[PDB]
Amino acid sequence: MTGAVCPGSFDPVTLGHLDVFERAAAQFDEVIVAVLINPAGMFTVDERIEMIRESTADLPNLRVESGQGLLVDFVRERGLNAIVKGLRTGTDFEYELQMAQMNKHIAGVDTFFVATAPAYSFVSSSLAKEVATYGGDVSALLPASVHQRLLGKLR
Amino acid sequence: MTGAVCPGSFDPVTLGHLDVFERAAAQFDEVIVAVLINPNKAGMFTVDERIEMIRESTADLPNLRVESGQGLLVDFVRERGLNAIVKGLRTGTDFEYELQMAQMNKHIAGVDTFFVATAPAYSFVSSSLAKEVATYGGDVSALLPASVHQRLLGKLR
Amino acid sequence: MTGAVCPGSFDPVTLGHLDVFERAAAQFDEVIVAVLIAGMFTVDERIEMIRESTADLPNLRVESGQGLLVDFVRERGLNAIVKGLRTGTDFEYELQMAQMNKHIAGVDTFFVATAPAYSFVSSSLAKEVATYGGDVSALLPASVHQRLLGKLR
Amino acid sequence: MTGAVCPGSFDPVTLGHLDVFERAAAQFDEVIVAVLIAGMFTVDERIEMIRESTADLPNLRVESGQGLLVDFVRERGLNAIVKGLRTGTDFEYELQMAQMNKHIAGVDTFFVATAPAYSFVSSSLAKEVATYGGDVSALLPASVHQRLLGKLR
Amino acid sequence: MTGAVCPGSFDPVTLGHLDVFERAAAQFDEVIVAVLINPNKAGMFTVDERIEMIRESTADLPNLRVESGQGLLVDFVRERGLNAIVKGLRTGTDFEYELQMAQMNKHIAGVDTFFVATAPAYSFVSSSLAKEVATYGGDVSALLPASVHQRLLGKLR
Amino acid sequence: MTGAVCPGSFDPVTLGHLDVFERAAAQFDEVIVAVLINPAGMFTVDERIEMIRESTADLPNLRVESGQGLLVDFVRERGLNAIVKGLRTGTDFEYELQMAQMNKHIAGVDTFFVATAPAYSFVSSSLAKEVATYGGDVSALLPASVHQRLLGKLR
Ligand SMILES: O=C(O)CCc1c[nH]c2ccccc12
Ligand SMILES: O=C(O)CCc1c[nH]c2ccccc12
Ligand SMILES: O=C(O)CCc1c[nH]c2ccccc12
Ligand SMILES: O=C(O)CCc1c[nH]c2ccccc12
């Protein structure tokens, strides 16, 4: 039985994230989305977890959990040793490569990167929030449920 | 039954490739190494030679097999009932041009591509640079499996 | 009297190229597509395919050329190039030619990011995929696609 | 009726920025420099410094703004941004914002490669160097440089 | 009498830094490690601690010395009668932003900068990532000299 | 006594190359410019060597020699173990990094990279030849003597 962890802050989850979740769930027997609790953002951890669960309702082999500290501990504690992450640019690859090599060195945990779907290559949680704050329409870039909650926080 | 295809020309296979094979074999139920052959331009090693060098250095990976092919990689993948490619990457430059091919492959056949950063120690080895260095007498013994190094010197002499 | 030149081999023109043409036509009074003159299509064929695909762009025209792009540009009274860009790698090598062109002829180059949907399309990859039976119909203008099938079949 | 907006904080404007302004003014009928509103200079100060440095550009004006750049652009009847670029790293992060801006408001972005001589100048590095006594006089408009000395001395 | 300055905050020095020091010491008659201290924000280690960790792991480099400084690097370099900086680089992204600073330093003071690719084995270590990983309990003993690892754990506990 | 080798095809030498030569000569006791003879280009090896010698007449600690085969053999045969090369882009760095790591691995030879002077960041031997072929003026980008010879070959 194979498995991977998809880590992030997901504040909020975007369609870019969801695309990665879907592709991981299609290729591994089990996927765990790991939501970081940090020393902070727009949505509480529980809010983020619920938005991810709504968006991944049709992925039966994917579950969502929170964690803190070293990601490789979160991964190994659950019997796995693979991370799956989405990538948008060469710059992304160079920073993430450092962390991937470090994670493999310290804990034997592998990282698999997947290129973003072209349609979602310019979406990030940060930019979506920023645009929405000033009234820009980001409804095509977020799951439907997320866009609903986001308008709420902003009002 | 999960599975992935690890493609390349593997002319010859390097320790960087082998590292990628091992990591894929650890994470997928089956792995197929796809040895892509250009029917127009012969490489240094024949198809038989390429496959033998890979098999000899992967004997301890019981869920990996090696097959050659040509034409579209996505056809090789789909005809085996799979839809994942695993490829090793060294640089940001690598990521950008492989990004193009992965998006195209997803578009035309729904095949996914997963990239892995190769191990630091093998980051600077490529089949082509190993060949070039060996051609002019440089020592590349530590970058190639034992199944390769002396066959390579043999080809060159 | 603003104007820009959109250069390339366009063998064949793709929807990525067409997107750039449309954006250049929307921002300059005058756009010329400059077709460089052994690929798949003849110069006349490439010109025709672009003309077919840009009929709704009244301020655009298509011409062939040879030699330095800056001479093609300057001989038509203009001094700006508009070119599409996909990657950072693209930017760094196009940057060298942009600075060279500015240096030798005072011709400016404006780059525009490809539309997300065409980030992975190029003339070369479309031909390669199509050659092995892959469906590239969503990546090429309708006219082009039929013509491409013909060259292969 | 062509036009483009050149955005930034310009704290202060550098010769790199000015080069881009001049190139945009040469290719569009109308250029607006958009100054975003705790840096070194006040908004009024930054606006003044740019106006001083662009007196020879008759089709350029300088205005301050807040919020989404695309709204600043659209509210003035335009839909193009012109921005200067130094590196491939620059292109990849600016690319994300360019595609976002096109998506949300249909505003195009044209990038231009910095002049070779200004490849290493930025507002931040000029301030940092000047703060420790380094001579940045060859990298800033004459007016700006004097004003900068004043803020430090 | 040739010479180069190797700058950094070295908070703490890593094996990647040490590799760069050794390569500079091999190619220049004298090398000065320049420990740059921000008078506004304290790092994890004091200036004394940073210098001691560097000295302890460079004892076999007789043409290298260690001095702290602040403000413009080019002033530190020129006041010692030198005009070369040697810096290690990992990525293309590293090269682009260090490129800016090297051009600026050449412009304002005529100081040259030479970059070296760090060794593959140390490519992914940085002072900041080593600190972050150690903070949350990860094992970074193989990435730092002996002079550093336990002092680091000490700071953290 | 310190030393470095500056390798290339130099077909022809540009002001970008010369800038690198000057900076190497200022920092090492001895510099050797190594001109590759290849399996080819516009200028013969002897022509290239003479153009480099004219351009570096004021660098007494720099000499010019031809070589073939493995660069690290050329370097070690002359008692040195350092290469100095100019770099223009991050892309350049990524390709050259591979070769530098390989050269250090196989022969213990170090490589030091130096960023191009801003004024010469867009010049290359290849682009200068191409531009000159079609009548473009590249005289500000090449040593004076080189531009003279180049016009000759083209006529
Ligand atoms: O955003 C990421 O890629 C990593 C998030 C992350 C770091 N440590 C973690 C521990 C538990 C869950 C998530 C994380
Ligand atoms: O592909 C490109 O961008 C350059 C094509 C090109 C070079 N010189 C040219 C002259 C005329 C028309 C096109 C060209
Ligand atoms: O620096 C930039 O390129 C963006 C500045 C910017 C964002 N929103 C803006 C609104 C008005 C004027 C300027 C801005
Ligand atoms: O162009 C380069 O950087 C390398 C040229 C080169 C490779 N092997 C060489 C051997 C002798 C002289 C030069 C060379």
Ligand 4 contacts CB of residue F8 (under 6 A): yes
Pairing of strands A110-115, B112-117: antiparallel
The answer for B111, left when phi > 0, alpha when psi is -120 to 50, beta otherwise, is: beta
Ligand nearest to the CA of D71: 3
Q: What is the CA A108 to chain-centroid distance, rounded?
A: 21
Phi then psi dihedrals of residue D45, to 5 deg: -60, -45
Closest CA to C101 of D109, F134, E74: F134
Residue in C88, C116, C120 closest to A90 by CB: C88
Torsion sign, CA atoms C10, C103, D53, D47: positive
The structure's method of determination equals X-ray
- According to DSSP, the residues that pair with F65 across neighbouring strands are F34
For residue E41, indicate whether it is catalytic: yes
3-state secondary structure of E71: coil
Q: Does D80 touch chain C (CB under 8 A)?
A: yes
Q: What is the CA B147 to chain-centroid distance, rounded?
A: 15
Q: Does B151 touch chain A (CB under 8 A)?
A: no
Q: Which residue has the tokens 């077909």?
A: F11
**Other C-beta atoms lying within 10 Å of the C-beta of residue B6:** 26
Report the residue of chain B nearest A28, measured CA to CA: B2
B113 C-alpha to center of ligand 1: Å? 23
In angstroms, rounded to a whole number, what is the distance separating the alpha carbons of residues F28 and F110? 14
Token pair belonging to B9: 């020309």
Q: Does D58 touch chain F (CB under 8 A)?
A: no
Give the active site residues of B: 17, 41, 90, 127
Contact (CB, 8 A) for B114 and A84:
yes
Q: What is the DSSP letter of C23?
A: H
In angstroms, rounded to a whole number, what is the distance separating the alpha carbons of residues E143 and B115? 25
Closest CA to F93 of F67, F72, F114, F78: F114
Q: Which helix (H) or strand (E) holds C116?
A: none
Minimal CA separation from A142 to chain D, in Å: 13
Q: How far is CA B81 from CA A28, B78, D35, in A?
A: 15, 5, 56
Minimal CA separation from E1 to chain A, in Å: 38
Q: Which one of D33, D36, D95, D109 would you pick to mutate in the ligand 3 pocket, going by the greatest count of ligand atoms within 8 A of its CB?
A: D36
Q: Could you name the CATH architecture of A1-155? A: 3-Layer(aba) Sandwich (3.40)
Alpha-carbon dihedral angle through residues F53, F55, F57, F58, given to the nearest 10 degrees: -140
3-state secondary structure of E2: coil
Residues present in chain D in total: 153
D66 C-alpha to center of ligand 3: Å? 7
Instruction: Find the DSSP H helices in A32-143.
Output: 45-55, 71-77, 90-107, 125-133
Token pair belonging to B2: 């999960």
Closest CA to A132 of A122, A143, A147: A147
Number of H helices, E strands in chain B: 6, 5
Contacts of C48 (CB under 8 A, 6+ apart): none
Subunit partners of chain A (3 or more CB pairs within 8 A): B, C, D, E
CA of A70, closest atom in ligand 1: 8
Closest CA to F82 of B155, E105, E24: E24
- According to DSSP, the residues that pair with D108 across neighbouring strands are D80
C58 burial (CB, 10 Å; 0-12 / 13-18 / 19+) is exposed
Q: Where are the beta strands (DSSP E) in chain B?
A: 3-8, 30-36, 64-69, 84-89, 112-117
3-state secondary structure of B6: strand
Residue positions forming the annotated binding site of E for ATP: 9-10, 17, 88-90, 98, 122-128
Ligand 4 contacts CB of residue F86 (under 6 A): no
In angstroms, rounded to a whole number, what is the distance separating the alpha carbons of residues B100 and B117? 18
Report the residue of chain C nearest A115, measured CA to CA: C120
Omega prior to D116 cis, within 30 of 0:
no
For residue E17, indicate whether it is catalytic: yes
Contacts of D128 (CB under 8 A, 6+ apart): none
Ligand 3 contacts CB of residue D81 (under 6 A): no
Token pair belonging to E120: 């593959």
In angstroms, rounded to a whole number, what is the distance separating the alpha carbons of residues E11 and E47? 9
* Position D102, amino acid: K
Domain-by-domain residue ranges, chain F? 1-155
Ligand 3 contacts CB of residue D16 (under 6 A): no
Phi then psi dihedrals of residue B65, to 5 deg: -135, 165
Closest CA to D33 of D9, D57, D62: D62
Alpha-carbon dihedral angle through residues A89, A92, A98, A104, given to the nearest 10 degrees: -80
3-state secondary structure of E10: coil
- According to DSSP, the residues that pair with D8 across neighbouring strands are D35
Q: What is the DSSP letter of E50?
A: H
Contact (CB, 8 A) for F132 and C67:
no
Pairing of strands E30-36, E3-8: parallel
Resolution of the coordinates in A?
1.7
In angstroms, rounded to a whole number, what is the distance separating the alpha carbons of residues C76 and D119? 30
* Position D130, amino acid: A
Token pair belonging to F14: 């540009």
Q: What is the DSSP letter of E33?
A: E
Residue in B96, B100, B108 closest to C135 by CB: B108
* Position A111, amino acid: T
Closest CA to C43 of C33, C53, C58: C33
For residue E107, indicate whether it is catalytic: no
Q: Does F90 touch chain B (CB under 8 A)?
A: yes
Q: Exposure string (b/e) for B107-116, b if CB count within 10 Å is 16 or more?
A: bbbebbbbbb
Residue positions forming the annotated binding site of B for substrate: 9, 41, 73, 87
In angstroms, rounded to a whole number, what is the distance separating the alpha carbons of residues D3 and D25? 9
Q: Which residue has the tokens 């293309």?
A: E92
Closest CA to D70 of D118, D30, D109: D109
- What's the distance, Cα to Cα, between the start and end of chain F in Å? 45
3-state secondary structure of C80: strand
Q: Which helix (H) or strand (E) holds C55?
A: none
Contact (CB, 8 A) for F7 and F34:
yes
Q: What is the CA F53 to chain-centroid distance, rounded?
A: 12
Torsion sign, CA atoms F44, F45, F46, F49: positive
Contact (CB, 8 A) for B87 and A93:
no
In angstroms, rounded to a whole number, what is the distance separating the alpha carbons of residues A125 and F101? 38
D91 burial (CB, 10 Å; 0-12 / 13-18 / 19+) is buried
CATH topology of domain E1-157: Rossmann fold (3.40.50)
Q: Is F70 annotated as a binding residue?
A: no
Q: Which one of A36, A65, A92 would you pick to mutate in the ligand 1 pocket, going by the greatest count of ligand atoms within 8 A of its CB?
A: A36
* Position D29, amino acid: D
Report the residue of chain E nearest F115, measured CA to CA: E99
Report the residue of chain E nearest B122, measured CA to CA: E120
In angstroms, rounded to a whole number, what is the distance separating the alpha carbons of residues B12 and B53? 8
In angstroms, rounded to a whole number, what is the distance separating the alpha carbons of residues C36 and C24? 19
Q: Which helix (H) or strand (E) holds A23?
A: helix A15-27
B146 C-alpha to center of ligand 4: Å? 29
F66 burial (CB, 10 Å; 0-12 / 13-18 / 19+) is middle
Angle between helices B92-109 and E92-109 in degrees, nearest 10: 140
In angstroms, rounded to a whole number, what is the distance separating the alpha carbons of residues B63 and B55? 12
In angstroms, rounded to a whole number, what is the distance separating the alpha carbons of residues E108 and C80? 33
Contact (CB, 8 A) for F142 and F12:
yes
CA nearest ligand 2 atom 9, residue: C69
In angstroms, rounded to a whole number, what is the distance separating the alpha carbons of residues B86 and A114? 10
For the domain made up of D1-153, the CATH class stated in words is alpha beta
Q: What is the CA D42 to chain-centroid distance, rounded?
A: 15
Token pair belonging to A52: 């991810």
Closest CA to E149 of E132, E130, E136: E130
Mutation pick from B104, B111, B113 vs chain C, by most beta carbons of C within 10 Å, is B104
**Other C-beta atoms lying within 10 Å of the C-beta of residue C29:** 13
Residues of E in contact with A70 (CB under 8 A): 133, 136-138
Contact (CB, 8 A) for B17 and B88:
yes
3-state secondary structure of C74: helix
3-state secondary structure of A62: strand
Minimal CA separation from A28 to chain B, in Å: 7
In angstroms, rounded to a whole number, what is the distance separating the alpha carbons of residues C126 and C105? 34
Q: What is the DSSP string of D5-51?
A: EEEE--TT--HHHHHHHHHHHHHSSEEEEEEE---SS-HHHHHHHHH
In angstroms, rounded to a whole number, what is the distance separating the alpha carbons of residues F150 and F154? 6
E22 burial (CB, 10 Å; 0-12 / 13-18 / 19+) is middle
F117 C-alpha to center of ligand 4: Å? 22
**Other C-beta atoms lying within 10 Å of the C-beta of residue E62:** 8
In angstroms, rounded to a whole number, what is the distance separating the alpha carbons of residues D113 and C105? 15
C45 burial (CB, 10 Å; 0-12 / 13-18 / 19+) is middle
Task: Tell me, letter by letter, the H, E, C secondary structure of chain F.
Answer: CCEEEEEECCCCCCHHHHHHHHHHHHHCCEEEEEEECCCCCCCCHHHHHHHHHHHCCCCCCEEEEEECCCHHHHHHHCCCCEEEEEECCHHHHHHHHHHHHHHHHHHCCEEEEEECCHHHCCCCHHHHHHHHHCCCCCCCCCCHHHHHHHHHHHC
Report the residue of chain B nearest C116, measured CA to CA: B103
Token pair belonging to E83: 């005009």
Contact (CB, 8 A) for A78 and A5:
yes
The angle formed by the CA atoms of residues A43, A45 and A49, to the nearest 5 degrees, is: 100
Token pair belonging to F103: 């050269």
Contacts of E52 (CB under 8 A, 6+ apart): E147
A53 burial (CB, 10 Å; 0-12 / 13-18 / 19+) is middle
Closest CA to B10 of B65, B59, B52: B52
Catalytic residue among E55, E65, E90, E155: E90
Residue positions forming the annotated binding site of B: 9-10, 17, 41, 73, 87-90, 98, 122-128
**Other C-beta atoms lying within 10 Å of the C-beta of residue D44:** 11
Torsion sign, CA atoms D73, D75, D76, D78: positive
Contact (CB, 8 A) for F113 and E115:
yes
In angstroms, rounded to a whole number, what is the distance separating the alpha carbons of residues E128 and D85? 29
Q: Which residue has the tokens 């051609």?
A: B135
Q: Which residue has the tokens 């479309």?
A: C126
Token pair belonging to B36: 């892509």
Q: Which helix (H) or strand (E) holds A20?
A: helix A15-27
CA nearest ligand 4 atom 8, residue: F71
Ligand nearest to the CA of F48: 4
F128 burial (CB, 10 Å; 0-12 / 13-18 / 19+) is buried
3-state secondary structure of A18: helix
Q: How far is CA B100 from CA A27, B106, C121, C125, in A?
A: 21, 10, 8, 9
State whether A115 and B117 contact (CB < 8 Å). no
State whether E75 and D129 contact (CB < 8 Å). no
Contact (CB, 8 A) for B76 and B5:
yes
- What's the distance, Cα to Cα, between the start and end of chain A in Å? 45
Token pair belonging to D146: 């004097």
Instruction: Specify the long-range contacts of residues B149-155, CB closer than 8 Å, at least 24 apart.
Output: B151/B12, B151/B45, B151/B49, B151/B53, B152/B12, B152/B44, B155/B44, B155/B45
In angstroms, rounded to a whole number, what is the distance separating the alpha carbons of residues F90 and D89? 9
* Position A112, amino acid: F
Q: Which helix (H) or strand (E) holds E52?
A: helix E47-57
Contact (CB, 8 A) for D45 and D79:
no
A141 burial (CB, 10 Å; 0-12 / 13-18 / 19+) is buried
- What is the Cβ-side half-sphere exposure of residue B11, based on CA atoms within 13 angstroms? 16
Q: Which one of C37, C43, C72 would you pick to mutate in the ligand 2 pocket, going by the greatest count of ligand atoms within 8 A of its CB?
A: C72
Q: Does A118 touch chain C (CB under 8 A)?
A: yes
